[PDB]
Amino acid sequence: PETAKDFGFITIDHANHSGTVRVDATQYTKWNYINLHTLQIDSAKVTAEGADDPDTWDLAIHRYDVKTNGGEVLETDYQSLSALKNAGSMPQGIFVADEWTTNKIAVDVSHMGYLIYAPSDFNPELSKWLNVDTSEMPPIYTPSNKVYLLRMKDDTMAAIRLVSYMNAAGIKGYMTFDYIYPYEP
């Protein structure tokens, strides 16, 4: 059995500043908004005319796509939140902001010659957490297994690591990630 109690902040550890988020991102018509500040989940429709973003959010997931709310992401070389925590040093690298896209966020795959996209923000760096090789029949799914640093507008930081992109039946689009928020070396 799988209820609504199986989605959202399924794990919260206020002492360790850690937790686990699980969202159903199988629909092409929806954004799943995550608020790491309030430990809250929300969703809204996304059409060919864009989306209705809530007043407050830190990141959003559509299928395997990620967008941030004026945030910037760095893909670290660490493959564990523990490995990052132990390093005791801020990982160096260029933080990547969102890009404005008109051909990335698919909202209608019913013409699959034609594929309808939403004009939308997109973070190409955090979305690296899953690679989908479309030149293969069927496509090949390769998770980076890397730890991502998310620097939000207020200069607070989160360390995100995708745990799974499939449910127990192998259905793709059920996204589970572990985080450290707020992350401080």
3-state helix vs strand vs coil in the chain, percent to 5: 10, 50, 45
Q: Is the distance from CB of 28 to CB of 108 less than 8 angstroms?
A: yes
Q: Is the distance from CB of 126 to CB of 150 less than 8 angstroms?
A: yes
Kindly tell me the burial class for residue 149, based on how many C-beta atoms sit within 10 Å of its own C-beta (0-12, 13-18, 19 or more).
buried
Q: Which residue has the tokens 């297994």?
A: 145
DSSP string, 99-114: EEEEEEEEEE-TT---
Whole-angstrom Cα distance, residue 81 to residue 56?
A: 26
The number of folded domains in the chain is 1
Whole-angstrom Cα distance, residue 123 to residue 57?
A: 15
Domain that holds residue 131: 1-185
Q: How far is CA 16 from the centre of its chain?
A: 21
